[PDB]
Amino acid sequence: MMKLGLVRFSMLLALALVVLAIVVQMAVTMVLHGQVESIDVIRSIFFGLLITPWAVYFLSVVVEQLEESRQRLSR
Known part of the structure; x- marks a missing residue:
């Protein structure tokens, strides 16, 4: 559910x-x-x-990245 960009x-x-x-x-x-x-x-x-670890870490960052719509859902 939680998303940004x-x-x-x-x-x-x-x-x-x-x-x-x-x-x-x-x-x-x-x-x-x-x-x-x-x-x-x-x-x-x-x-x-x-790309495996990169995609994982990146995805997480993207998930937290408060872009377009404020979300920030990473810990």
Whole structure:
């Protein structure tokens, strides 16, 4: 029931989280000068598996993200 933007092609604020996350990841990656392969990615396709935890954590964030209609239902 509880929703905000995740209803019909919405949720703009989320983009800021994506961009921010990307920037943060870039900074962290730069700071953590650890030569291995690619921030523990082990092949591009492998990233797909990361979509599981990412989607879960992200969905939760999106669920809490007070976008369009104030909701905030995460703990």
